[PDB]
Amino acid sequence: TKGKATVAFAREARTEVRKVIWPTRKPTKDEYLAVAKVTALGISLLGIIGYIIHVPATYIKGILK
Amino acid sequence: KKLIPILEKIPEVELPVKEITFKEKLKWTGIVLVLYFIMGCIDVYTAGAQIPAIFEFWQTITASRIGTLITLGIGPIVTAGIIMQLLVGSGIIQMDLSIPENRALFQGCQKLLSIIMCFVEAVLFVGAGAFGILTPLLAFLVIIQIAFGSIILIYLDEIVSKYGIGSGIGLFIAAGVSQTIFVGALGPEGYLWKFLNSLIQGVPNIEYIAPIIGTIIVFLMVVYAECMRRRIVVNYAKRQQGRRVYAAQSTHLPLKVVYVSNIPVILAAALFANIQLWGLALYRMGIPILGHYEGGRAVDGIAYYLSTPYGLSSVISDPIHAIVYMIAMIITCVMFGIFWVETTGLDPKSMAKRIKKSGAFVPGIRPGEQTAKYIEHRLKRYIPPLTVMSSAFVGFLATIANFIGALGGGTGVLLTVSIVYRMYEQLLREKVSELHPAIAKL
Amino acid sequence: ETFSKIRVKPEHVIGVTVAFVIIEAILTYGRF
RNA sequence: CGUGAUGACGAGGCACUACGGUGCUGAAGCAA
RNA sequence: ACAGGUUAAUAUUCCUGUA
RNA sequence: AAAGAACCCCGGCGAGGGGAGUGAAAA
RNA sequence: CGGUAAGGUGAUAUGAACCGUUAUAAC
């Protein structure tokens, strides 16, 4: 029983911290955007490489199917 | 005693204690990446050029691509890991890894099973009618190639894992999703065009651009996190000098937010992956234990209630269906998450050492930094949630990320975005370790 | 570490993979 | 002396543990 | 303004019970 | 003119020192 | 209020953040 209570409390106590941790720039007129940048940049490379390697052929497999 | 005999027969990868330059870890990774994409271009040798649509549900988490030399993809490896976490998780086979024994036991063992699940899935796939023509002869041939391709990955993972950057799996998944996006949106039968063309044709189709939006929205959302750092610290430290770089210092932060539960959810989604597969499989090859599929996927049964709704647009026409899934996923997440504890996870024990040195100590001077050295409980406490939180947090997000639905896979995009960032970090911790040949633990 | 009594150098797995490709890449396509 | 207090504390046990130590419980608890 | 209790370090100052 | 000696070695992640470079010169 | 100006936020004092390059930078 108690176990559930503590678990429920921890979640609440955490939600409180999230309130204190923000000010800065919520988080910063450069931070957030960063993640999206690096993240998108990375996905672009992996995605681009797949396209160059992908499609390219599909044109042959179909033109010779 | 253990399955050590055949276990010792299962090859491994020669890890050189030599100099593996950043440039080389990089160039290595890349070679793996391509052999992957490439294998995803090659169809499996099979006269029956006719295949029954596809399983729009397994590909994403599996990083596979049905009909190709990797039609099974990471699927096995994940399955395997799933069981282990299940056994070694629900105590069923209690193990205290600590010793290099249990550690290398849990591992080596799982690895094997991965090859077991490698073939099983193969057979199960064809047996689920993934290709249409069950020519016992031809069927056999296929299975061969199939599971053998997945094998190559298992070893390609090993390579990356000890010769390059990031992780095979992690990579692979991101590899697939990214492509699935760049191609789906811009490739041959690309959507951006189908939409663009539809505009020119004069009959603006909101259904061609739709899925593309779905993906932006998700990406933006999924990203939300990994930014809730928390500028803090800090300590004091001391030591010379000094002209420019001298005055004592320490370490800053914060670091980020999310990830940890990266492998956990990969397993939850993967569980469902082996259900829709295992149900259809044990459908057109037996009794409707799990559910009545028909039409390819499932339209009733455990299977039905446990089939992710995404693809193009969110389905409202079945509220209850939504509710269950969500809750179903949520809990499954909690699970593998807990099973990740009994095993291992973002630990304070480990952060202790390293958050108790940043500064000095030493003899020369009086640089402070008491920290620290007995004040860890402050982490395990503030910690718990961090990763999480979870089976509803991440798991929730992931799920809702699917209702919304997006290209590549709402959930897939998620993992990807994460994997990609944890992959950026990897590229930095490296760009630096390529200077001070020592601090390979700070 | 690993109890794998056998050691395999990556250069191999890579080349072994270039194998699967060539085989099926021609075993299938290039019909006749 | 009542009450404060069918409360607390409390020898000792059932637990984890880094080995600094920490939780659950709990007898008697009066008189000359 | 007393008796318990508590901090690595405070104490008829903090917590409790009772003034 | 700080270019105030990267990096390597002994030594107690010492003291001190030997190389290596900076410098016209580290006489 | 006047001069002056591509440079500045006194020193040990670096860094950090900023202010200015044309007439409310600074002196």
CSV table of N, CA, C and O (backbone and C1' of nucleotides) in Angstrom, one decimal, chain B residues 235 348 351-358 361 368-379, chain E residues 8:
chain,number,residue,atom,x,y,z
B,235,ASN,N,30.0,23.6,-6.8
B,235,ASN,CA,31.2,23.4,-6.0
B,235,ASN,C,32.1,24.7,-6.0
B,235,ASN,O,31.6,25.8,-6.2
B,348,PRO,N,23.0,6.6,-9.9
B,348,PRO,CA,23.7,7.5,-9.0
B,348,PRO,C,25.1,6.9,-8.6
B,348,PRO,O,26.1,7.6,-8.7
B,351,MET,N,27.8,8.1,-10.6
B,351,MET,CA,27.8,9.5,-10.6
B,351,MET,C,28.5,10.0,-9.4
B,351,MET,O,29.0,11.1,-9.3
B,352,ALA,N,28.4,9.2,-8.3
B,352,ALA,CA,29.1,9.5,-7.1
B,352,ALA,C,30.5,9.8,-7.4
B,352,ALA,O,30.9,11.0,-7.4
B,353,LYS,N,31.3,8.8,-7.8
B,353,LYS,CA,32.7,9.0,-8.3
B,353,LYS,C,32.6,9.8,-9.6
B,353,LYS,O,32.1,9.4,-10.6
B,354,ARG,N,33.1,11.0,-9.6
B,354,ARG,CA,33.1,11.9,-10.7
B,354,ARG,C,32.4,13.3,-10.4
B,354,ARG,O,32.5,14.2,-11.1
B,355,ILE,N,31.6,13.2,-9.3
B,355,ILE,CA,30.9,14.4,-8.8
B,355,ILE,C,31.5,14.6,-7.4
B,355,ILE,O,30.9,15.2,-6.6
B,356,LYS,N,32.7,14.1,-7.3
B,356,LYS,CA,33.4,14.2,-6.0
B,356,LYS,C,34.9,14.5,-6.2
B,356,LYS,O,35.7,14.3,-5.3
B,357,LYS,N,35.2,14.9,-7.4
B,357,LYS,CA,36.6,15.2,-7.7
B,357,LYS,C,36.7,16.6,-8.4
B,357,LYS,O,37.6,17.4,-8.1
B,358,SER,N,35.8,16.9,-9.3
B,358,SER,CA,35.8,18.1,-10.0
B,358,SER,C,36.3,19.3,-9.2
B,358,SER,O,35.5,19.9,-8.5
B,361,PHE,N,41.2,18.7,-4.3
B,361,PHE,CA,41.6,17.9,-3.1
B,361,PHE,C,43.1,18.1,-3.1
B,361,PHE,O,43.6,19.2,-3.0
B,368,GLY,N,38.6,24.1,-2.1
B,368,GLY,CA,37.5,23.4,-1.5
B,368,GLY,C,36.8,22.4,-2.5
B,368,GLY,O,37.3,22.2,-3.6
B,369,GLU,N,35.8,21.7,-2.0
B,369,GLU,CA,35.1,20.7,-2.8
B,369,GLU,C,34.5,19.6,-2.0
B,369,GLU,O,34.2,18.5,-2.5
B,370,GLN,N,34.5,19.8,-0.7
B,370,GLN,CA,34.0,18.8,0.2
B,370,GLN,C,32.8,18.0,-0.4
B,370,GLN,O,32.7,16.8,-0.1
B,371,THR,N,32.1,18.6,-1.3
B,371,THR,CA,31.0,18.0,-1.9
B,371,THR,C,30.0,17.4,-0.9
B,371,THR,O,29.4,18.1,-0.1
B,372,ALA,N,29.8,16.1,-1.0
B,372,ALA,CA,30.5,15.2,-1.9
B,372,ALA,C,31.4,14.3,-1.2
B,372,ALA,O,32.3,14.7,-0.5
B,373,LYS,N,31.2,13.0,-1.4
B,373,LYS,CA,32.0,11.9,-0.8
B,373,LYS,C,31.2,11.2,0.2
B,373,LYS,O,31.7,10.3,0.9
B,374,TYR,N,29.9,11.5,0.3
B,374,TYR,CA,29.0,10.9,1.2
B,374,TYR,C,27.6,11.5,1.0
B,374,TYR,O,26.6,11.1,1.7
B,375,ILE,N,27.4,12.4,0.1
B,375,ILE,CA,26.1,13.0,-0.2
B,375,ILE,C,25.6,12.6,-1.6
B,375,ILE,O,25.5,13.4,-2.5
B,376,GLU,N,25.3,11.3,-1.7
B,376,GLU,CA,24.8,10.8,-3.0
B,376,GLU,C,23.2,10.7,-3.0
B,376,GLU,O,22.6,11.0,-4.0
B,377,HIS,N,22.7,10.2,-1.9
B,377,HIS,CA,21.2,10.1,-1.7
B,377,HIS,C,20.5,11.2,-2.4
B,377,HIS,O,19.3,11.1,-2.8
B,378,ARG,N,21.2,12.4,-2.5
B,378,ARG,CA,20.6,13.5,-3.1
B,378,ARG,C,20.3,13.3,-4.6
B,378,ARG,O,19.5,14.0,-5.2
B,379,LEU,N,20.9,12.3,-5.2
B,379,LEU,CA,20.7,11.9,-6.6
B,379,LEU,C,19.6,10.9,-6.7
B,379,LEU,O,18.5,11.1,-7.3
E,8,A,P,23.7,14.5,11.6
E,8,A,O5',25.2,15.1,11.7
E,8,A,C5',26.3,14.3,12.3
E,8,A,C4',27.5,15.1,12.4
E,8,A,C3',27.5,16.5,13.1
E,8,A,O3',27.7,16.3,14.5
E,8,A,C1',28.6,16.8,11.0
